[PDB]
mmCIF file of C-alpha atoms and ligand atoms in Angstrom:
data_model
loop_
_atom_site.group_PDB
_atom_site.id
_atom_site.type_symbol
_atom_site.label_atom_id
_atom_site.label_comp_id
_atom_site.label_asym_id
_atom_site.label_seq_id
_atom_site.Cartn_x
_atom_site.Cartn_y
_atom_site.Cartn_z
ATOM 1 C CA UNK N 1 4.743 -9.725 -32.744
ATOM 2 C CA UNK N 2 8.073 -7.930 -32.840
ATOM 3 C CA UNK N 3 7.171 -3.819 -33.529
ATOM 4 C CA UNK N 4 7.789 -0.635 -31.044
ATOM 5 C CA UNK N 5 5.013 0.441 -28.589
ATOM 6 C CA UNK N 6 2.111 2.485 -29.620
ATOM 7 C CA UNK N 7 -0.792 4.368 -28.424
ATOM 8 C CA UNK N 8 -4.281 3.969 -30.288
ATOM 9 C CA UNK N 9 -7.578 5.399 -29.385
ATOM 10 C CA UNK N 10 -10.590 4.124 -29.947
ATOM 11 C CA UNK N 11 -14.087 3.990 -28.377
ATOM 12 C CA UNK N 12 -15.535 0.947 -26.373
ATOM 13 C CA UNK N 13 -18.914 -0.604 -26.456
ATOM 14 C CA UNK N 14 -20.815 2.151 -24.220
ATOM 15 C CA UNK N 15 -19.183 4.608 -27.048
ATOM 16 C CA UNK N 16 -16.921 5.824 -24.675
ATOM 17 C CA UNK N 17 -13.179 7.238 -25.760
ATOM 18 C CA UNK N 18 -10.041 5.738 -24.223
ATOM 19 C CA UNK N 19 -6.434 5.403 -25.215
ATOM 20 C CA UNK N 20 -4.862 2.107 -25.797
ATOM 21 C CA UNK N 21 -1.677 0.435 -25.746
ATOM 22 C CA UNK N 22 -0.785 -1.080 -29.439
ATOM 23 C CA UNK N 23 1.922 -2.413 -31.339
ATOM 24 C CA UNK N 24 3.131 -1.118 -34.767
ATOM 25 C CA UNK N 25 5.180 -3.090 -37.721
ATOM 26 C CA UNK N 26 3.279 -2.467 -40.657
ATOM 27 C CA UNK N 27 -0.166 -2.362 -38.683
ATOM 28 C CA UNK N 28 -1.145 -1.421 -35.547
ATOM 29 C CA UNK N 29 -1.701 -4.615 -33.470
ATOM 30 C CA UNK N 30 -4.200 -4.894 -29.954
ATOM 31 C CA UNK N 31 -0.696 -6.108 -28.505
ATOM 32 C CA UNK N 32 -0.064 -3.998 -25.148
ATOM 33 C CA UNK N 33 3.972 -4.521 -24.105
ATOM 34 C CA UNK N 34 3.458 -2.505 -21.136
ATOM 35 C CA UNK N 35 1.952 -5.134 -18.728
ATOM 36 C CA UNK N 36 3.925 -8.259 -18.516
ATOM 37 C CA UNK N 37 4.396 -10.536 -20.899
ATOM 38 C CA UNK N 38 1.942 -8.474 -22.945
ATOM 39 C CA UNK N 39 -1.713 -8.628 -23.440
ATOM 40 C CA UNK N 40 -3.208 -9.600 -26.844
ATOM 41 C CA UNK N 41 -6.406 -9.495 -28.834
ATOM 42 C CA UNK N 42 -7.589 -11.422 -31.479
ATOM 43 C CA UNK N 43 -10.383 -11.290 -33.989
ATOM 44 C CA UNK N 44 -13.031 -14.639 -33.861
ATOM 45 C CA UNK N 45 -14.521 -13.209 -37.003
ATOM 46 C CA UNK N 46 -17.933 -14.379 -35.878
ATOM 47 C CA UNK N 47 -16.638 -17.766 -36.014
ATOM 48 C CA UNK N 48 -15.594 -20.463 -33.310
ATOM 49 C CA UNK N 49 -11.639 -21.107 -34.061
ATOM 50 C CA UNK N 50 -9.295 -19.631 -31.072
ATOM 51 C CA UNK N 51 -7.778 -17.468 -30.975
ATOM 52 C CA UNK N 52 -8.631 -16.342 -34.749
ATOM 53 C CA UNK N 53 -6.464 -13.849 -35.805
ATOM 54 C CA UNK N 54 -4.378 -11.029 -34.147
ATOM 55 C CA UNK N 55 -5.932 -7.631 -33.874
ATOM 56 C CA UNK N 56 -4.615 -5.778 -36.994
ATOM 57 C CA UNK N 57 -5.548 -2.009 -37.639
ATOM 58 C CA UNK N 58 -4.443 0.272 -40.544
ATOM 59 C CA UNK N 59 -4.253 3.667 -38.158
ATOM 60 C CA UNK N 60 -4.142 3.058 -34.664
ATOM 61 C CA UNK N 61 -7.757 4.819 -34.718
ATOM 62 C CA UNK N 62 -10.211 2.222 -32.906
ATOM 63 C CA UNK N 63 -13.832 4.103 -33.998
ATOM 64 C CA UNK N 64 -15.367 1.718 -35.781
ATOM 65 C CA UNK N 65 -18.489 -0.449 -34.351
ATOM 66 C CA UNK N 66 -16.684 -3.205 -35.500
ATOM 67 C CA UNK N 67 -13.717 -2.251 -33.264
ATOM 68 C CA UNK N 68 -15.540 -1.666 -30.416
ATOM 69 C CA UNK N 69 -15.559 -4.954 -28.294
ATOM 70 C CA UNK N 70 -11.813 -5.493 -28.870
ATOM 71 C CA UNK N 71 -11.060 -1.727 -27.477
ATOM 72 C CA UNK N 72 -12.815 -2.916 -24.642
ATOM 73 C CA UNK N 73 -11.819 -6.493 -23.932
ATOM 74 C CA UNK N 74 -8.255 -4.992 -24.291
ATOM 75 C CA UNK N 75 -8.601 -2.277 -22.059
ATOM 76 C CA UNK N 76 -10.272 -3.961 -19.769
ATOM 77 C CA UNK N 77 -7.632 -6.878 -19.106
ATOM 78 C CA UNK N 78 -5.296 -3.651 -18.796
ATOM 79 C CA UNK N 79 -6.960 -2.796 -16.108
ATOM 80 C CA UNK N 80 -7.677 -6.126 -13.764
ATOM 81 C CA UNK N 81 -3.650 -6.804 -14.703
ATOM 82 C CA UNK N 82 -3.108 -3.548 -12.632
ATOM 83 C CA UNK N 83 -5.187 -4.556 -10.241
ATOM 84 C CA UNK N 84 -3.914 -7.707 -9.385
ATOM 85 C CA UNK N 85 0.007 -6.603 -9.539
ATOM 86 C CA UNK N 86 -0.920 -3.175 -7.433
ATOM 87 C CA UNK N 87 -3.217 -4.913 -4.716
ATOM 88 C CA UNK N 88 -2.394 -8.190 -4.338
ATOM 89 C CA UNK N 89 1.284 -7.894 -6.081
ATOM 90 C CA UNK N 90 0.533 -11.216 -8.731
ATOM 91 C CA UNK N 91 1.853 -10.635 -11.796
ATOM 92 C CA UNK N 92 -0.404 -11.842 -14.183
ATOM 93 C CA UNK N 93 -3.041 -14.925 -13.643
ATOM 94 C CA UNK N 94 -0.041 -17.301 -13.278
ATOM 95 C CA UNK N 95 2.025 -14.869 -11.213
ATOM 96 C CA UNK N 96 5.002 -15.032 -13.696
ATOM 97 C CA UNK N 97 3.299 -12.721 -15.850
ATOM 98 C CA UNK N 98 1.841 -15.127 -18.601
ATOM 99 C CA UNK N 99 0.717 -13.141 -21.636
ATOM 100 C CA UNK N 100 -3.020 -12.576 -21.385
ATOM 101 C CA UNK N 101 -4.775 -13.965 -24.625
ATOM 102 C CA UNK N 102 -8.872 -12.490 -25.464
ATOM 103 C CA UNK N 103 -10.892 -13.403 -28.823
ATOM 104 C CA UNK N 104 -13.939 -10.584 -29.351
ATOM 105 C CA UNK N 105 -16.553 -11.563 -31.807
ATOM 106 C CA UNK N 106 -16.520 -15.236 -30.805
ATOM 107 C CA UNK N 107 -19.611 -17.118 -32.738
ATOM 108 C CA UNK N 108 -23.305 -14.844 -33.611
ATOM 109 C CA UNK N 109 -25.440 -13.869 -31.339
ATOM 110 C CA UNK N 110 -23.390 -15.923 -28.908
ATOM 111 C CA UNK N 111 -24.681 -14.687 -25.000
ATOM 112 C CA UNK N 112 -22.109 -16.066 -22.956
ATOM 113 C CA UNK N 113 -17.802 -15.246 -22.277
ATOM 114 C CA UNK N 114 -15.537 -17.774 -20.865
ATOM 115 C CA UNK N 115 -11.864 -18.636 -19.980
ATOM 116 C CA UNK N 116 -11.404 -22.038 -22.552
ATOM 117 C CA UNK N 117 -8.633 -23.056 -20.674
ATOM 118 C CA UNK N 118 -6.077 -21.104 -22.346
ATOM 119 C CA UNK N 119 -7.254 -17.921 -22.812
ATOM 120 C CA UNK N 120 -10.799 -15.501 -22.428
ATOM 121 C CA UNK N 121 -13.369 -15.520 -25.454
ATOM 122 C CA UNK N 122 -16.725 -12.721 -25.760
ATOM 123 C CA UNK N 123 -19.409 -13.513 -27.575
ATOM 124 C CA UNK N 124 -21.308 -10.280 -29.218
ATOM 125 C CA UNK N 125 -24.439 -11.243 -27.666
ATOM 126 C CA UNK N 126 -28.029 -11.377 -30.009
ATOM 127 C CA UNK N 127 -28.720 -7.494 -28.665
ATOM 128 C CA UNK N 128 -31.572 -8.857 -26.692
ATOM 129 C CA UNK N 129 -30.023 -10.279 -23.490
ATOM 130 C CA UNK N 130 -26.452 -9.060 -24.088
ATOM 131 C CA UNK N 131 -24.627 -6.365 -25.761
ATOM 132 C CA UNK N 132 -20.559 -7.259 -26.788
ATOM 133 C CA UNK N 133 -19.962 -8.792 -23.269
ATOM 134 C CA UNK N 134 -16.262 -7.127 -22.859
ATOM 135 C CA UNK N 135 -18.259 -4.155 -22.802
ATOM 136 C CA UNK N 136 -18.467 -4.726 -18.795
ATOM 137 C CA UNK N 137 -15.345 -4.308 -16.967
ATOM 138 C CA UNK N 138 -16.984 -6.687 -13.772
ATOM 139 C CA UNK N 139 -17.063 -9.357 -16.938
ATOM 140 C CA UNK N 140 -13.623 -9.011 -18.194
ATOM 141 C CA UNK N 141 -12.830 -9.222 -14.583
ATOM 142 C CA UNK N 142 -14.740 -12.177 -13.728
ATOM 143 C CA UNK N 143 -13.059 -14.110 -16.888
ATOM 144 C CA UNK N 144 -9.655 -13.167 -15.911
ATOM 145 C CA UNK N 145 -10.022 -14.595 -12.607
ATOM 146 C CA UNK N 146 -11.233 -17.906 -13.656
ATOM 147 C CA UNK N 147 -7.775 -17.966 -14.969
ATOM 148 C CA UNK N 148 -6.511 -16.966 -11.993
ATOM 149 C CA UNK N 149 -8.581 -19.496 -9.875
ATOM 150 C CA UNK N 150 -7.373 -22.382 -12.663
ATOM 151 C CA UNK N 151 -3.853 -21.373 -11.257
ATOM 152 C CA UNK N 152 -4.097 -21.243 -8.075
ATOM 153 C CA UNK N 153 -6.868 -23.303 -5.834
ATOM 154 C CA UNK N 154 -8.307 -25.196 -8.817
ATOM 155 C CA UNK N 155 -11.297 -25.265 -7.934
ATOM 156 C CA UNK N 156 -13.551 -28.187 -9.581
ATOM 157 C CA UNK N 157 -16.234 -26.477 -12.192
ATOM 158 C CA UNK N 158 -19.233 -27.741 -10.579
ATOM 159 C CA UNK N 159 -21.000 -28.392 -7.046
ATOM 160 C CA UNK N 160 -19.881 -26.700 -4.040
ATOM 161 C CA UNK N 161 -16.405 -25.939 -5.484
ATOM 162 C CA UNK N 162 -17.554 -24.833 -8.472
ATOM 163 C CA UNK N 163 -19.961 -22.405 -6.909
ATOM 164 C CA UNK N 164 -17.117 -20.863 -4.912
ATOM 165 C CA UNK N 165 -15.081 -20.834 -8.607
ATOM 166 C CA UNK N 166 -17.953 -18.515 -9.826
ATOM 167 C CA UNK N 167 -18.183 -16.401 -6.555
ATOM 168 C CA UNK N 168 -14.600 -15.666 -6.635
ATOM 169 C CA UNK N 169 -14.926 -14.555 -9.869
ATOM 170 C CA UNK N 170 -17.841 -12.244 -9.587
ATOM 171 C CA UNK N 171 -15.904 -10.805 -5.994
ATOM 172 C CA UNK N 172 -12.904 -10.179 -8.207
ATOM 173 C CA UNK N 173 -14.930 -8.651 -11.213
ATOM 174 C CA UNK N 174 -16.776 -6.201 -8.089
ATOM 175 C CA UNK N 175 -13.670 -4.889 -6.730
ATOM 176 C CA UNK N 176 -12.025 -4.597 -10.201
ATOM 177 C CA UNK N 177 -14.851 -2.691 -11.037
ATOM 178 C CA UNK N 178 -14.929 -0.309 -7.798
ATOM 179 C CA UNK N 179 -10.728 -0.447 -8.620
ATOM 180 C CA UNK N 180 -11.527 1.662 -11.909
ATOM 181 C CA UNK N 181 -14.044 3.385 -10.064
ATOM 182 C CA UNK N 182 -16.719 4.264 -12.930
ATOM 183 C CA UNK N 183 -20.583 2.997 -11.975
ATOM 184 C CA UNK N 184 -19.181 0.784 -9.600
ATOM 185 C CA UNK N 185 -21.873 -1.281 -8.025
ATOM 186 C CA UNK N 186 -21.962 -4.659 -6.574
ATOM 187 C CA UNK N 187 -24.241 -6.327 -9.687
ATOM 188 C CA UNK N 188 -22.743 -7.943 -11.628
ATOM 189 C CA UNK N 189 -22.945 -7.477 -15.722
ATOM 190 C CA UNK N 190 -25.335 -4.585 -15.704
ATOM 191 C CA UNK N 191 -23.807 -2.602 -18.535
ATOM 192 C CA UNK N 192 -24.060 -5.475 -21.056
ATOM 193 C CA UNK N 193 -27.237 -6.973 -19.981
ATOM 194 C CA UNK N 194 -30.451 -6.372 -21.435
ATOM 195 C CA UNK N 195 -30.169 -3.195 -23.294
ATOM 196 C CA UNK N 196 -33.804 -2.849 -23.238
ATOM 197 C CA UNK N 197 -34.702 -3.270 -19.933
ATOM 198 C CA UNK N 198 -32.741 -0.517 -17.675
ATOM 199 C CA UNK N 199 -31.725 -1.296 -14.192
ATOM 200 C CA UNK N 200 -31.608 -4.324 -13.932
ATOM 201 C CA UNK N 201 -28.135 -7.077 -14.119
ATOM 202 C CA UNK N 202 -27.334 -10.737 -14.578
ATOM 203 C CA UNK N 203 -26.720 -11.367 -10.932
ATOM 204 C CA UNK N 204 -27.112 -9.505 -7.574
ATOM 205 C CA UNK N 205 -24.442 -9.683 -4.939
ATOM 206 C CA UNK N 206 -26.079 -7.507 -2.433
ATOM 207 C CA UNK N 207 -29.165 -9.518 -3.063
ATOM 208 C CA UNK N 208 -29.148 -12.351 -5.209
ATOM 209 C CA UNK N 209 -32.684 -13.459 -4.524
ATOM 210 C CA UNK N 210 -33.891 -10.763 -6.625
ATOM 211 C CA UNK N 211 -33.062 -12.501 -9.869
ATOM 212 C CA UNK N 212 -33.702 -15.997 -7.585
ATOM 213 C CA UNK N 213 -30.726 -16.957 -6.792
ATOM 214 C CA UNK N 214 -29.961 -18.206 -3.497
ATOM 215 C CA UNK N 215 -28.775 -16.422 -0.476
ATOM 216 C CA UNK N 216 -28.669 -18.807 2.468
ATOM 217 C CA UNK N 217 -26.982 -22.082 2.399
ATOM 218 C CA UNK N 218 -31.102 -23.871 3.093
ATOM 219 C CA UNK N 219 -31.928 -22.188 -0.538
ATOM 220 C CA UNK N 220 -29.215 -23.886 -1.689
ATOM 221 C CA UNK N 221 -30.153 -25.490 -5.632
ATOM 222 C CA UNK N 222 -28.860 -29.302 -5.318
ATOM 223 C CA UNK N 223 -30.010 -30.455 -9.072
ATOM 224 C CA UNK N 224 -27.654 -31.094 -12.180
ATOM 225 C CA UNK N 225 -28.664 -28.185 -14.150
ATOM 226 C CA UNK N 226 -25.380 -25.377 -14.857
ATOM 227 C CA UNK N 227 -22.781 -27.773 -13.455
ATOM 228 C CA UNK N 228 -25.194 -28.192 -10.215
ATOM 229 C CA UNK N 229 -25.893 -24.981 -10.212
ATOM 230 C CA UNK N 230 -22.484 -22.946 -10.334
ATOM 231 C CA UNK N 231 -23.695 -19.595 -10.942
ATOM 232 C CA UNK N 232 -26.950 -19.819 -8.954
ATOM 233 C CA UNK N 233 -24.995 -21.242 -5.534
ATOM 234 C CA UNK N 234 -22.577 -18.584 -6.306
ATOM 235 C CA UNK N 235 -24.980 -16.398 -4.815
ATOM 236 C CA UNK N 236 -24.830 -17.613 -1.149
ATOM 237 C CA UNK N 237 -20.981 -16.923 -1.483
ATOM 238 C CA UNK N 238 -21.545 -13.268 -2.972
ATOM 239 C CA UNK N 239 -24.045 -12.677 -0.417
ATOM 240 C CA UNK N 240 -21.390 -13.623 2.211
ATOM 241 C CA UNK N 241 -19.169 -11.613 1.017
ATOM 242 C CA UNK N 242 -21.294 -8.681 0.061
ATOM 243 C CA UNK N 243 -22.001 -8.248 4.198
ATOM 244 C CA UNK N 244 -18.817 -8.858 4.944
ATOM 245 C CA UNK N 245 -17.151 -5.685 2.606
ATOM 246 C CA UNK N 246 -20.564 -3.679 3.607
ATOM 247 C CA UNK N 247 -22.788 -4.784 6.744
ATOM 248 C CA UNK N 248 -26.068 -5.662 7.028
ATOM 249 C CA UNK N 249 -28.360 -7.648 8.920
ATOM 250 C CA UNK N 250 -29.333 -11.029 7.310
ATOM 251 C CA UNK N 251 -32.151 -13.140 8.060
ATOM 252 C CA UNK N 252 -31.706 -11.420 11.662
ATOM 253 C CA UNK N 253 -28.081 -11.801 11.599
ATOM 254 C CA UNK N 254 -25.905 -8.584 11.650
ATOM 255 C CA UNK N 255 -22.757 -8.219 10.344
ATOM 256 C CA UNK N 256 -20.361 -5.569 11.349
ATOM 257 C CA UNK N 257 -18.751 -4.245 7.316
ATOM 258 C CA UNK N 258 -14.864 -4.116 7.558
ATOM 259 C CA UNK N 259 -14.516 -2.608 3.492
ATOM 260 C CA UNK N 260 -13.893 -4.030 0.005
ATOM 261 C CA UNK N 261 -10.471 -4.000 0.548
ATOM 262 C CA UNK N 262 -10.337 -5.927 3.716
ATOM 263 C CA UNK N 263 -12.726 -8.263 1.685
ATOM 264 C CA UNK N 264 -10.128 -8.437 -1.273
ATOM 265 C CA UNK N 265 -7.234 -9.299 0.818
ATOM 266 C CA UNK N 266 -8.670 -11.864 3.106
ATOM 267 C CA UNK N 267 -10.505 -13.828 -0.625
ATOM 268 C CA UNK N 268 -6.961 -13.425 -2.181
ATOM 269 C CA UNK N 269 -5.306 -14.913 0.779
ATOM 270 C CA UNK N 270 -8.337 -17.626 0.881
ATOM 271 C CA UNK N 271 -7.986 -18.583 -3.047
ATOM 272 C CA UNK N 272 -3.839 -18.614 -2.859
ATOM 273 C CA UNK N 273 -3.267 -20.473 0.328
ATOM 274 C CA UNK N 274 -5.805 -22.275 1.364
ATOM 275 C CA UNK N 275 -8.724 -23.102 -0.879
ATOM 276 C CA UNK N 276 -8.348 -26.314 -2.982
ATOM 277 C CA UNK N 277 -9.600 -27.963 -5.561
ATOM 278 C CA UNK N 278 -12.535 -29.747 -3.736
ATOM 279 C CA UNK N 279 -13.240 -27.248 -1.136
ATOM 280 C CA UNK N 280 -16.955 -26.609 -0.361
ATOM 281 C CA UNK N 281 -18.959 -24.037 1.690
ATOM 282 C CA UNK N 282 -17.729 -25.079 4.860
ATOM 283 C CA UNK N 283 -14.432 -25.166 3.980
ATOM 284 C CA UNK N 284 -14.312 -21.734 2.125
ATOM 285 C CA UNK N 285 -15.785 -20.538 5.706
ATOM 286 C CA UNK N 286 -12.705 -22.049 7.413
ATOM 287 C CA UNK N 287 -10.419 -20.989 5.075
ATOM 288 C CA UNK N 288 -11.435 -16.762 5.078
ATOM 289 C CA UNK N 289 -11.343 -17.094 8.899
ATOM 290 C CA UNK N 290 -7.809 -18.389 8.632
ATOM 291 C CA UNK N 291 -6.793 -15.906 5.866
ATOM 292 C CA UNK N 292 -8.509 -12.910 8.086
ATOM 293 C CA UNK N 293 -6.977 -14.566 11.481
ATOM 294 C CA UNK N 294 -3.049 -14.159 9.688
ATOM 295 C CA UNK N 295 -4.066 -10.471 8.818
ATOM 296 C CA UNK N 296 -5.778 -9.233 11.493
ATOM 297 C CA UNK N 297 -5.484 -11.694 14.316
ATOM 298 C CA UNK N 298 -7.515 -13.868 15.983
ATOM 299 C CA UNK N 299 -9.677 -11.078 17.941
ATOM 300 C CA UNK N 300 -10.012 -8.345 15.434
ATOM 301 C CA UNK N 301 -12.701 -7.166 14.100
ATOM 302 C CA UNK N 302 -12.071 -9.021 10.735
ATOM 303 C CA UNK N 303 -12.391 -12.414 12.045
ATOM 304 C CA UNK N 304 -15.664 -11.702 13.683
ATOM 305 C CA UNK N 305 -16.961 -10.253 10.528
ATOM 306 C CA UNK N 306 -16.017 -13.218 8.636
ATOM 307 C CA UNK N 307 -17.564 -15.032 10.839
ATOM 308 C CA UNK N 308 -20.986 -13.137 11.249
ATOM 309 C CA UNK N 309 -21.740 -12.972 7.526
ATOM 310 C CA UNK N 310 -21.020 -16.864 6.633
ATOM 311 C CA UNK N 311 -23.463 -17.910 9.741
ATOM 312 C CA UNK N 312 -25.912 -15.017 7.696
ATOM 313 C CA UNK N 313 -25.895 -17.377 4.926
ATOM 314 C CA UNK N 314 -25.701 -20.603 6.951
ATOM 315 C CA UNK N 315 -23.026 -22.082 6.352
ATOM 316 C CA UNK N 316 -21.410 -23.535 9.353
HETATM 317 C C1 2G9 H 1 -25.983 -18.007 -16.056
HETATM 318 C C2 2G9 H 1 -25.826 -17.327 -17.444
HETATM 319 C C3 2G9 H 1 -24.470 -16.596 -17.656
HETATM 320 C C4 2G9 H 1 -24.386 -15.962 -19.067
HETATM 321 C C5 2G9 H 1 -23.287 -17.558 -17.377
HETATM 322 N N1 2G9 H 1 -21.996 -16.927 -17.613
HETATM 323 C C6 2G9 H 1 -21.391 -16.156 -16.677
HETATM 324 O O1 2G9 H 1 -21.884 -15.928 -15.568
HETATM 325 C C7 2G9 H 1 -20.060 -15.545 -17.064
HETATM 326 C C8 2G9 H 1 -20.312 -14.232 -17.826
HETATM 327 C C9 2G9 H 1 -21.030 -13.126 -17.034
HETATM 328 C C10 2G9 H 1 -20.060 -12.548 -15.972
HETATM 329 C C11 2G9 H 1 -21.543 -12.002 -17.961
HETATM 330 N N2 2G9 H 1 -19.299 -16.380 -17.990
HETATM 331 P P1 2G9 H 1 -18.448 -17.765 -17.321
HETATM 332 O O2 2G9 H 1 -16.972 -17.627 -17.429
HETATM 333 O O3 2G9 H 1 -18.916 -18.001 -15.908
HETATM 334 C C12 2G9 H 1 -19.010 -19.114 -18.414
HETATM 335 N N3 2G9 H 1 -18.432 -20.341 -17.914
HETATM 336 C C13 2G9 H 1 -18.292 -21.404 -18.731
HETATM 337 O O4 2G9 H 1 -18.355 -21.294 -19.954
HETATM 338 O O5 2G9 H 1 -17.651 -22.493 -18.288
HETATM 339 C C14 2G9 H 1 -17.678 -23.722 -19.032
HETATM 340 C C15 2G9 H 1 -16.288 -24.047 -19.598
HETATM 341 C C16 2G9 H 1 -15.826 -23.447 -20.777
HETATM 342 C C17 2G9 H 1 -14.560 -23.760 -21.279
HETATM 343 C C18 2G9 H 1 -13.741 -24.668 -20.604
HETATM 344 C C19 2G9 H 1 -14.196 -25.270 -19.426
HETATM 345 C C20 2G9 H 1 -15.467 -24.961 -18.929
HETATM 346 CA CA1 CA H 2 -8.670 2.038 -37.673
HETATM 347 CA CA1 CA H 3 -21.361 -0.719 -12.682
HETATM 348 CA CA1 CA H 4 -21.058 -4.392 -11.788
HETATM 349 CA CA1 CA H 5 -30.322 -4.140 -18.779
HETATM 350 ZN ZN1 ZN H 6 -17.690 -17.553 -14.429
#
């Protein structure tokens, strides 16, 4: 909408306080002008109808439990926008600075987010297995880059390519989360997961075999269940790139860390120049030795790391 730049504060989903950027003509509207071509949030109304209806407050004060998911799925794509103009210099997930679209209070009791094509949705959760999922910045993160991904390689939603689609997404959601730098960890959705049960997270990137998900190629799930197994394969990619950022020795395979932001710049490379839509393991492997080869060159450090932590995961 057309209105002058505001600043709102509310509290997020954790009941923390942060500022955010609004837009007033006769309300105040989760419409931030400062990134892009803006970044928008809509209300679902515990219904199923995208986008539903643009934020609308009466005060610019964001207290309410009510409120609470939007401050956060709104501050939160503030945030992995920054990220991916200051790191890797895109400018929004179609790198012409498309305007960034998020629904909060999609459906009831609704444990799941997603990109729908067009823009990101949040469920609430049922308060069992999720809280409001925007509550987790790795989450926002993770959505955002499927959008990003859908841009860019393409890759197919399901097998091999679809596995690497969710890995890339849960890198991108880690080092957006270590990028804000508050609890950062290398879990993924542990402060909207399972509110009664503390310590634990939906997936594992540093091991993913403690909530059984794979992390060697032989583990590997090859059924039809979850697209053939998208975000359980995902974890031989996270794994991979989990030693790569940090070291480790892997089923007697060491791997010499080279840093998150070594890993960021050699996935970005990997997703914008040379993954496609039907790449697989092996290909993914190629292309980060490629990406870390026109970094770093062919006998640095980074291509041998690269290297070392996909044959830790077997894949060849
Ligand atoms: C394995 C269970 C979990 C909840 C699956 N979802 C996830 O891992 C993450 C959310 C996490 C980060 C909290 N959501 P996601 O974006 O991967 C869900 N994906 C999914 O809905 O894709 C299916 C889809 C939807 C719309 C258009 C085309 C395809
Ligand atoms: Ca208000
Ligand atoms: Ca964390
Ligand atoms: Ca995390
Ligand atoms: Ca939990
Ligand atoms: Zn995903």
């Amino acid at each position: 909408i057309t209105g002058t730049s505001t600043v709102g504060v509310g509290r997020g989903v954790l009941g923390d306080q942060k500022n955010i950027n609004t837009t007033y003509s006769t309300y105040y509207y989760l419409q931030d002008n400062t990134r892009g071509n803006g970044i928008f949030t809509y209300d679902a109304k515990y219904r199923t109808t995208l986008p539903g209806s643009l934020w609308a407050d009466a005060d610019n004060q964001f207290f309410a439990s009510y409120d609470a998911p939007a401050v956060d799925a709104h501050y939160y794509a503030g945030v992995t926008y920054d990220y991916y103009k200051n790191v890797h210099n895109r400018l929004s997930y179609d790198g012409n600075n498309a305007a960034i679209r998020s629904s909060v209070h999609y459906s009831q009791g609704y444990n799941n987010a997603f990109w729908n094509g067009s823009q990101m949705v949040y469920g609430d959760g049922d308060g069992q297995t999720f809280i409001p999922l925007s509550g987790g910045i790795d989450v926002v993160a993770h959505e955002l880059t499927h959008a990003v991904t859908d841009y860019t390689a393409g890759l197919i939603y399901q097998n091999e390519s679809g596995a690497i689609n969710e890995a890339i997404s849960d890198i991108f959601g880690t080092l957006v989360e270590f990028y804000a730098n508050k609890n950062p960890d290398w879990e993924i959705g542990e402060d909207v997961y399972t509110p009664g049960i503390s310590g634990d997270s939906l997936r594992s990137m540093s091991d993913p075999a403690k909530y059984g998900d794979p992390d060697h190629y032989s583990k590997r799930y090859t059924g039809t269940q979850d697209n053939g197994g998208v975000h359980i394969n995902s974890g031989i990619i996270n794994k991979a790139a989990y030693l790569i950022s940090q070291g480790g020795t892997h089923y007697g395979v060491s791997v010499v860390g080279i840093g998150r932001d070594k890993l960021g710049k050699i996935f970005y490379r990997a997703l914008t120049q040379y993954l496609t839509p039907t790449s697989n393991f092996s290909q993914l492997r190629a292309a980060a030795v490629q990406s870390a080869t026109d970094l770093y060159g062919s006998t640095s450090q980074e291509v041998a790391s690269v290297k070392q932590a996909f044959d830790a995961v077997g894949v060849k």
